[PDB]
Design an enzyme around this catalytic site. Sequence first.
Site, PDB file in Angstrom:
ATOM      1  N   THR A   1       0.857  -1.297   0.000  1.00 43.10           N
ATOM      2  CA  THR A   1       0.000   0.000   0.000  1.00 43.10           C
ATOM      3  C   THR A   1       0.813   1.232   0.000  1.00 43.10           C
ATOM      4  O   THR A   1       2.022   1.207   0.096  1.00 43.10           O
ATOM      5  CB  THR A   1      -1.035   0.001   1.115  1.00 43.10           C
ATOM      6  OG1 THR A   1      -0.527  -0.208   2.463  1.00 43.10           O
ATOM      7  CG2 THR A   1      -2.059  -1.099   0.816  1.00 43.10           C
ATOM      8  N   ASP A  17      -5.180   1.869   0.084  1.00 51.90           N
ATOM      9  CA  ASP A  17      -5.807   0.916  -0.755  1.00 51.90           C
ATOM     10  C   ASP A  17      -5.859  -0.385  -0.092  1.00 51.90           C
ATOM     11  O   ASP A  17      -5.290  -0.588   0.983  1.00 51.90           O
ATOM     12  CB  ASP A  17      -5.124   0.908  -2.131  1.00 51.90           C
ATOM     13  CG  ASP A  17      -3.652   0.471  -2.120  1.00 51.90           C
ATOM     14  OD1 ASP A  17      -3.404  -0.727  -2.349  1.00 51.90           O
ATOM     15  OD2 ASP A  17      -2.730   1.302  -1.807  1.00 51.90           O
ATOM     16  N   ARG A  19      -5.363  -3.642  -1.735  1.00 51.37           N
ATOM     17  CA  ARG A  19      -4.629  -4.741  -2.301  1.00 51.37           C
ATOM     18  C   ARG A  19      -3.575  -5.270  -1.315  1.00 51.37           C
ATOM     19  O   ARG A  19      -2.771  -4.457  -0.854  1.00 51.37           O
ATOM     20  CB  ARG A  19      -3.921  -4.441  -3.685  1.00 51.37           C
ATOM     21  CG  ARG A  19      -3.431  -5.654  -4.472  1.00 51.37           C
ATOM     22  CD  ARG A  19      -2.812  -5.247  -5.842  1.00 51.37           C
ATOM     23  NE  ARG A  19      -2.811  -6.320  -6.860  1.00 51.37           N
ATOM     24  CZ  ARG A  19      -2.208  -6.125  -8.101  1.00 51.37           C
ATOM     25  NH1 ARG A  19      -1.729  -4.914  -8.473  1.00 51.37           N
ATOM     26  NH2 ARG A  19      -2.223  -7.029  -9.059  1.00 51.37           N
ATOM     27  N   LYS A  33      -6.548  -1.827   5.221  1.00 56.68           N
ATOM     28  CA  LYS A  33      -5.338  -1.661   6.045  1.00 56.68           C
ATOM     29  C   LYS A  33      -5.410  -0.314   6.573  1.00 56.68           C
ATOM     30  O   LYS A  33      -4.312   0.165   6.792  1.00 56.68           O
ATOM     31  CB  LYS A  33      -3.993  -1.937   5.239  1.00 56.68           C
ATOM     32  CG  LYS A  33      -3.943  -3.327   4.619  1.00 56.68           C
ATOM     33  CD  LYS A  33      -2.551  -3.764   4.217  1.00 56.68           C
ATOM     34  CE  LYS A  33      -2.434  -5.026   3.263  1.00 56.68           C
ATOM     35  NZ  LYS A  33      -0.970  -5.372   2.955  1.00 56.68           N
ATOM     36  N   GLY A  47       4.132  -0.712   4.532  1.00 50.90           N
ATOM     37  CA  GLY A  47       5.289  -1.504   4.848  1.00 50.90           C
ATOM     38  C   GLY A  47       4.686  -2.875   5.174  1.00 50.90           C
ATOM     39  O   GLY A  47       3.781  -3.358   4.517  1.00 50.90           O
ATOM     40  N   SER A 129       4.930   2.632  -0.692  1.00 55.63           N
ATOM     41  CA  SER A 129       5.676   2.216  -1.803  1.00 55.63           C
ATOM     42  C   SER A 129       5.415   3.156  -2.922  1.00 55.63           C
ATOM     43  O   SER A 129       6.350   3.410  -3.676  1.00 55.63           O
ATOM     44  CB  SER A 129       5.253   0.737  -2.345  1.00 55.63           C
ATOM     45  OG  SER A 129       3.863   0.618  -2.733  1.00 55.63           O
ATOM     46  N   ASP A 166       2.864   1.716  -9.961  1.00 55.72           N
ATOM     47  CA  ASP A 166       3.466   1.040  -8.949  1.00 55.72           C
ATOM     48  C   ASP A 166       2.557  -0.118  -8.714  1.00 55.72           C
ATOM     49  O   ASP A 166       1.369  -0.073  -8.943  1.00 55.72           O
ATOM     50  CB  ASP A 166       3.631   1.884  -7.632  1.00 55.72           C
ATOM     51  CG  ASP A 166       4.797   1.409  -6.738  1.00 55.72           C
ATOM     52  OD1 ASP A 166       4.797   0.292  -6.118  1.00 55.72           O
ATOM     53  OD2 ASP A 166       5.736   2.249  -6.512  1.00 55.72           O
ATOM     54  N   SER A 169       0.568  -1.163  -4.883  1.00 55.55           N
ATOM     55  CA  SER A 169      -0.684  -0.513  -4.664  1.00 55.55           C
ATOM     56  C   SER A 169      -1.485  -0.966  -5.753  1.00 55.55           C
ATOM     57  O   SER A 169      -1.016  -1.480  -6.759  1.00 55.55           O
ATOM     58  CB  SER A 169      -0.586   1.044  -4.630  1.00 55.55           C
ATOM     59  OG  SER A 169       0.222   1.558  -3.603  1.00 55.55           O
TER      60      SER A 169
END
Lengths: 226, 249, 54, 244, 204, 237, 241
Positions: A1, A17, A19, A33, A47, A129, A166, A169
């Site tokens: 995320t 998000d 995923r 999350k 992380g 990320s 990316d 995400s």
Amino acid sequence: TTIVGVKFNNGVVIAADTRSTQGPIVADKNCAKLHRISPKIWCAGAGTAADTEAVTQLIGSNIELHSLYTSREPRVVSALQMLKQHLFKYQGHIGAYLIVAGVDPTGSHLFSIHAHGSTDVGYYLSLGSGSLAAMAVLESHWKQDLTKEEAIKLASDAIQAGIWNDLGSGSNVDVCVMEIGKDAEYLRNYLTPNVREEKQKSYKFPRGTTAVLKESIVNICDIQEE
Amino acid sequence: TDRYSFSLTTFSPSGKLGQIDYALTAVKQGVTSLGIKATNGVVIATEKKSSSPLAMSETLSKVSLLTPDIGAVYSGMGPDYRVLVDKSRKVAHTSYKRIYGEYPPTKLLVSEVAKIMQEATQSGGVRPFGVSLLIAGHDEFNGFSLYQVDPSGSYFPWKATAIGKGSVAAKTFLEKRWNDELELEDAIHIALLTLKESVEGEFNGDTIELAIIGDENPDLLGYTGIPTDKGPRFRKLTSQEINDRLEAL
Amino acid sequence: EFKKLDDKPSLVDVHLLESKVYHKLRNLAKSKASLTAARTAANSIYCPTQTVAE
Amino acid sequence: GSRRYDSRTTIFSPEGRLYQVEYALESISHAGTAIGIMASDGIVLAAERKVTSTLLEQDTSTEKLYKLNDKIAVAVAGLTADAEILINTARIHAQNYLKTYNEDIPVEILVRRLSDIKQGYTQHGGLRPFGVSFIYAGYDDRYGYQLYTSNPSGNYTGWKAISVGANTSAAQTLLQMDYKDDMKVDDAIELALKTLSKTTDSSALTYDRLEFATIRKGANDGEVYQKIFKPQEIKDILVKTGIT
Amino acid sequence: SDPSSINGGIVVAMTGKDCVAIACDLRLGSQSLGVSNKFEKIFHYGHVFLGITGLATDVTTLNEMFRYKTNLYKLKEERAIEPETFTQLVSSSLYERRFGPYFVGPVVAGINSKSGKPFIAGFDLIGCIDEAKDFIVSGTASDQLFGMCESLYEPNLEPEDLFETISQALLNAADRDALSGWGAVVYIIKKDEVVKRYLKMRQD
Amino acid sequence: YDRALSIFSPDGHIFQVEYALEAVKRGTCAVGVKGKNCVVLGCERRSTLKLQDTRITPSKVSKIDSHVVLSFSGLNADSRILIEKARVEAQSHRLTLEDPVTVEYLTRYVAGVQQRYTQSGGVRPFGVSTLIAGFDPRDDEPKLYQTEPSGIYSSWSAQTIGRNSKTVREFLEKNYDRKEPPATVEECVKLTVRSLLEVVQTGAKNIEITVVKPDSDIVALSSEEINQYVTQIEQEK
Amino acid sequence: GYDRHITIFSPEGRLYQVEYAFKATNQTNINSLAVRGKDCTVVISQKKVPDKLLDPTTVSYIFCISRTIGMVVNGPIPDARNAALRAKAEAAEFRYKYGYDMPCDVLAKRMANLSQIYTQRAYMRPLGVILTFVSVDEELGPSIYKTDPAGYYVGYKATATGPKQQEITTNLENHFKKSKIDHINEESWEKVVEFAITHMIDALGTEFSKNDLEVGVATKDKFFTLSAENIEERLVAIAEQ
């Protein structure tokens, strides 16, 4: 995320998000999350998933006690401090990356924390990320002081550029808008960019297409009767 | 040096643990409190008192929140409740909110606080807490429950009970006023009317402390857009609200 | 029949009505006697208020 | 200072006898009657509560009957407060045995462990011992059904039929005349209720003041089913045996 | 090399509708040698079923650990554990050894018996609560499973259909896996009854 | 905790040690008599009481080692603690030194448990005295020791502790010779039955006999065996 | 036996050891008067020094436990210092772990809880001091919380302490009866000092000097004390009222 947070005049928005990744393997299509330190102090985790969740739970207890001693809503800065110290005594072994956002009777705040114990201020903070990608969108179209109507759109567009540039995400954008004078609105699935397209077949079979060696009842649905 | 490890609470030759009998006297010197279990909520109520007219009773709480769905109320010593309320919240978190991620069952919480009592009657340097607690609550596996925590280190579930100086009279009040089906609204009206006879001063909603473990309030939830979670079942009533229920007697 | 099942606020009223009838029959020996019966069954002052007023 | 307020609580008397243990037996005589009867197909545990009231919820209470493990439950006679500590120690100990040998704890082992704690408290620390007496109903493969009484000193003694708490003498004498080794769980249920009707702690014995539990091998495949009867299931058996 | 992939094996879990089903293989060896086809990976507490993959020592040590705790719940509460509180409990007790971490992937599978609601969850290492209500995949051949699992599955199944899907997913993953192919068990888990069905499987 | 429950007296004593010995007097009677080929520990049981299952009720003789038996008089709560510590110690000797413990070693060990709490504060001594008996490995020499809660131990040719120990001991002055123990196992067994039949009486119900024969041969003689021995003594007398 | 010599319960259920603590705080004969202004809280207390050879400046009873929260002590000065030290330590600690300075409410509650623990322990003697904590918080406004040796505390509109405090209560009661509010409607903190001095003279009958007074004022976001020069300006200002 990835986590975006947008501080503005009327409140603060926080968006991340659903995923779930475990390595290049996508563990889950959906799994939120965004965590709650407090009712009004929502954070989100990036992380390692387990290092965020495990310490929002633990300080989640501490801040609740703190609230029950003051008989008043907890401050935002309290949460940051509880986290700072806890990360520092392991020497940045724990991999919590949290953006701590919250409303309280002092007003809107937005802070971030890094795994090592570093804390930064801002009017727009981004982490995880797809930090890099979310930031790019933001800095052209933003002006200081915006409405929630303007911001939720803006927040959201930035998490998109984490999806398409990316891979860490992806999936649905979930958002919590914590307003002054209202309860916080967790608008889960504000945006669904993509779903799984429907295939042309069902792979439903008659019985015996599976090979069976025996069967036998084993129950625990009772503790045995007389 | 220290050599206090000889238990202060010990058997007497006529049986009984002498120290907790002494402590129970202090509960019947304290304020009066009562709890009625309805089939659609629980009400707990106590009287606020002050030693000065310049004391504020809106800065004085004698019904406190342990968890959003479980409230507690005492009769006994002020100081002893003050310390023990914090420890009740703390053990509720360490033993079920960091292990099972949620607030403890009402049965579970009552048992744990009875252990804290038990070990304050074990070993030297510690005498009991001179309070009895009514711990009314709601869990999702046994519905409403009303408990009474003893300074002994034991508990008892009740259908309706009272504790404090005027307990004996108050429980005879509730005996005719309790029934198999009750409403939370009428439970409140019984509770105030009974506590009328156990208050010697004012009987305003500013001096009568009332709290329900009724049903959830999603305005006290603090967030929206999660329909799965239910707001605080506990809800302390503000003074104005209590005055409305006084007119509803 | 409901001497066996007497604890009821409803069966206090039976004894009161009985008093009101012996009253109008003009005997106040059995009115008094059945006042006294009502009193036992409302050893309680926690019987409905209307009953108590009566 | 510290020695000033101590009276040397746990010491022998000139007879050899431990003051606190002697005192402890008095306080267990305050607490209600609990009877255990070992049948040749189970163990019946039947206890009359030391509290009853019309406002007391006794329909969810299990204040005397507590399961330590799946094959071993206890009845309590003494201080409920004191007993609570030993009850959760027993649960930990039984689970510990299961963890390390992957085998269910025998009844002998569990009772011995609790007994050691009670002795230990009078031996050192100046601590009061637990003023409780338990009757353990337990099944094990090796000795079958085993019945045990423990006393507050910290010693355990086997029995076939035994009573602790209030009216120990009266209950015992009736049991001596009626007990037989050809008794079944059915017969033992009837005997227990009759004995409690003659050793009643007020002027009435009722279902709502009765806690009742069995451990029966009548569950299929030689398995043992612990059943703690609800007061309305007690009520059903109360009309069966003709107490009411 | 890593402790988890020495002892391998796979576990699949799939929701039905008013049913769930968890399946594993019975293969458990060290290195390339298969030792046994006499150890199953699936255990149960009340109505929750746990399959657990990864390092063998920590499979069997957490078997006892889970058992120990759910004994405390059963006796204390006087009711069985819910699949959602078995999840938090599994998570917490993994994360206590943060350092020298456990080397497994517990998979929680049950039916919350107070809504009739099907429930699955996943785990790896120290925690991480994986919410799905489709399927949960685990083991070293988690990639073989994840492929099979998405394609076959269709939202909502009857138990009769659920047996074919979950089996089929285990069947082709296990014999394209070196560390599975000896034995398999599939538990079809209704809330009125539990049918355990041994599968015949081709030799790997 | 360290507040004295054992403290020196102006009599040169500690009060609790004197009290401890009266606690053993009130206990049940254990007799020890050793032959030339056996040790015999027979003890009084309180199995007179009805509704008692003696299978699951503790015995008054507990083996600590394959060839070392221990009997006790005094509190039954206290005795089990000594029996558990003794066993743990016995297996430790096998671990680090090899061989089972000698009888003498165990005698010293139990004595050292009593000793520790006599001198230290915050602890009372036990009210339990033991008869530790047995054989050593590769020895057919019977060993009969007595340990007491004082922290002292003494070997004996025959000894008795518990209630009416004076009475049994007086009987043993004429029925036991230092020069000549009972020649056979059977005469030793019947002598211990004979001593018990003084005070204990009341059939073979309350009479127990455990015989240990050289090098780890422990047999317990059931009530049926005892009944035969009792009848022979009764008839002869 | 020892039901009055240590903190164990008596047959009365009343702890005699605890009662004795309150029977030592009025033996120092220091009165205090504390009033809530509209923007401030003012506390004045006695500072009777009857000696030439005691320096009066160092004779004090107002100790600054936070930069915003004052504390005025009625009762023995050894126990005062210990309670001040402990309170300062906790207030600092609260900043450190929660990221903001300790509220007056919670600082009162914390000392209250420690007092209970000191009467739980049978070898520990409680600190026999009545502590008044004055502040202006931003979430509670002008506030007074008064803790006592047992471990009981509550908020206050106004409060007094000392042997002659009943007289002080009479003045305060009339003031808030007439105003019909829980504070003084005065928007200058200096004039709340002037008012406080007036009611101290009324209650005790004693005419004060600058060296018999010691004044602490919590305004918004700072706590200061008046020096004797500044207190003299107030005493001159009584003549100008």
